[PDB]
Ligand binder design. Structure first.
Ligand SMILES: CC(=O)N[C@@H]1[C@@H](O)[C@H](O)[C@@H](CO)O[C@H]1O
Ligand SMILES: CC(=O)N[C@@H]1[C@@H](O)[C@H](O)[C@@H](CO)O[C@H]1O
Ligand SMILES: *[C@@H]1O[C@H](CO)[C@@H](O)[C@H](O)[C@H]1NC(C)=O
Lengths: 225, 107, 225, 224, 107
């Protein structure tokens, strides 16, 4: 009887560039001949979804309906309603979802932080941390590119947006990339790229290597017979 | 290097308004108060929600695009000697300052 | 009916230096003088479940039955049960919990990363981050000690334990302390203290200061020869 | 029959994380079927004494009885009693143990002195000294952590506390650990860890290494 | 650098209980009289039981959480050269000196 609405996540909109909104019809009694569609504010039908879901292991019905739509229509602030029909429902289910807008957008401010020299003594693993602070809403994507090409999602780890202690409504996140010792010693650069709506160009990035912090070292050597 | 010196008498019930150039659009405009001990400048309020601990609830900001004027308004003043307050913009603080103003509080 | 249990956690065992275990009954009818209590493995009665709370004002029931058994048994392996009987269910229900025995041990290695120079350039707020990594048991308790006595929990934020990218079963964790900028320039210890049960003394401290990452700039090797 | 009770001590309770209060008896005539019982203020059941001691060399028997409690009970003022009953007494003996309340607390600041330059000329062994001073009461227990793993308790020595010379109630205590210069000059860290009640976490520590007194700016190392 | 100035007058036992801010934070608190000859500061009264040798019995301290105040009172003044006394907190002294005062003992 329930219809959750899975919005297109900015991680998915940015990773795939093919934004699709899902109509997760959950907890119906299992019956056949189920059609799920979508309409925008004007109420007209959309393309039929693929990948029909199976019945839930909880002896109930779980279905997914995804529609690929133009991104400007999704960000226009329109109302998008999934239309669900069934045999046990006296009336079709009319699931309305839109932007949870009305939030003060703040651009993320990335700050890279390199491994401490105490870590760089075992010569086992360096952990570069891409601390992201002062951003709203609670949505952000972080990738790690080296020499211009990205890296596997299994090498770096990203946390979840926790609320900031001294700033309500503003979140922060973390991200760790674990390299081996020698690559960071060769000075090979690493790039942390952050995608978020409030960014002026929707994408920012920062760079780091061995020689970021290293100042000038006047090694003098007096001598007078 | 400009020194638009503006002053006031300043007591406790008096409220002080400081005019800063609006840099236009949005670029982290802030008001910074020089730290005499450190010899450098220290932020008191910026575009972000930061407000200095002793200045909590005592400072407010008003941007005026119609006049391009940035008003820093302090409702209650007291012993806080008006040393130097600098209007500034941008991420870095010391690079982004202009109006190096100072004003007395007693008379 | 809902009968859930809160077994003692390592942080809870640590800060109070005592062990408290509770079980909660939820979604019962709004009825007073219900029967909820705790008992031991042998069936011995425990200290009374004092401080009973009021029902949840959404027509549900909210009351917790607690018990104070010292740590001498929690590390032995004797599972506990709490008796729950009520007008809805007259049969006394038992809620069985025990510590998760059968987990490896790994020393939680700890580092401090000072704020990036970009933070200081804003003259706005530093964010010292205590990183803990490579510990096998999930739970770990991290807090911040300034000048040797504690700070309020509303000035630092601790991330939940997360699985490691490359390590098989170990975990990592972050803590961030958002100090005032000018205070870090003055310089304080800001000791990050971590408590975890694989440590020898179960306590480890790290500390950093403004004059901790400063490198030498003059290798004035003067030789007379 | 003379009773002799050893209450739990902070070092003992903390090193093994297992509280254990004990009472033995001397002057007890050598005879079997000795009776050692333990009771609380409420006088409930206890753990039965195990591995009873044998007779003393001077033709008298030794009976020892220990018990395990919850640690907060010892700090709650509970005066646990042990009853010693045998067949050589006119009246059964008992001895009651309570924590010495009324004592002040003072945080032991831990200072770590590196070995002297004179000692680092003979080139056989340096001696790092950990100086636990200005604490109250006296029950500290130090240990030397060497890069994560502990060290054998025969490589370091601790001393019983003495009263402070100038401070009335403040005590102090020493500790030494011996190394050899060929590893001390290498620069690996050595840490002194101190456990005492007055500490905010009951554990504090300090670190030292050979490159600690150096000013870390420049390292004017004139050669020949 | 915040600095008050309590100048006194009693040539005998006419003391004065200097008022110092409380961190309320349970760190060591102290008063430190600057050593003119050395050019640095020297502790006289601390949270610990220390009392300066010449000031034994003549100086006491009171903490007021109700008023958040730290009163250092000297019952008898030897009319000696009264330098600058700084209230402070924390382990290290010269870091912790918050406010500094100087008061004449004679008139
Ligand atoms: C890498 C490098 O240039 N190291 C030099 C070393 O060769 C030179 O002999 C001495 C004095 O300048 O110290 C430094
Ligand atoms: C980083 C560095 O080179 N530090 C040097 C060290 O190598 C050298 O042994 C010492 C004098 O011998 O002077 C210092
Ligand atoms: C510093 O100078 C010493 C002088 O002997 C030399 O051995 C060492 O290599 C120098 N270090 C660097 C980093 O140049």
């Amino acid at each position: 009887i329930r219809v959750f609405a899975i919005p297109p996540s900015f991680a998915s909109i940015f990773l795939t560039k093919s934004t699709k909104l899902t109509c997760l019809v959950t907890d119906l009694t299992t019956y056949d001949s189920v059609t799920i569609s979508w309409t925008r504010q004007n109420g007209e039908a959309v393309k039929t979804h693929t990948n029909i879901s199976e019945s839930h292991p909880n002896a109930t019905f779980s279905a997914v309906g995804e529609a690929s739509i133009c991104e400007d229509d999704w960000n226009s602030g329109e109302r998008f309603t999934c239309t669900v029909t069934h045999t046990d429902l006296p009336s079709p289910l009319k699931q309305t979802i839109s932007r949870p807008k009305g939030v003060a957008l703040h651009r993320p401010d990335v700050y890279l932080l390199p491994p401490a020299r105490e870590q760089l003594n075992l010569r086992e693993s360096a952990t570069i941390t891409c601390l992201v602070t002062g951003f709203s809403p609670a949505d952000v994507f972080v990738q790690w590119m080296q020499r211009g090409q990205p890296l596997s999602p299994e090498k770096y780890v990203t946390s979840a947006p926790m609320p900031e202690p001294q700033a309500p409504g503003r979140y922060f996140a973390h991200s760790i990339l674990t390299v081996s010792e020698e690559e960071w010693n060769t000075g090979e650069t690493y790039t942390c790229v952050v995608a978020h709506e409030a960014l002026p160009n929707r994408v920012t990035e920062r760079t780091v290597d061995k020689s970021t912090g290293k100042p000038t070292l006047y090694n003098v050597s007096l001598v007078m017979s | 290097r400009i020194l638009p010196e503006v002053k006031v008498e300043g007591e406790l019930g008096g409220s002080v308004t400081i005019k800063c150039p609006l840099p236009e659009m949005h670029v982290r405009i802030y008001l910074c108060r020089e730290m005499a001990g450190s010899g450098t400048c220290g932020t008191v309020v910026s575009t972000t929600n930061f407000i200095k601990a002793e200045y909590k609830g005592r400072v407010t900001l008003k941007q005026y695009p119609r006049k391009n004027l940035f008003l820093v308004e302090v409702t209650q003043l007291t012993e806080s000697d008006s040393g130097v307050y600098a209007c500034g913009a941008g991420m870095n603080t010391d690079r982004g300052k202009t109006q190096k103003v100072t004003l007395n509080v007693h008379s």
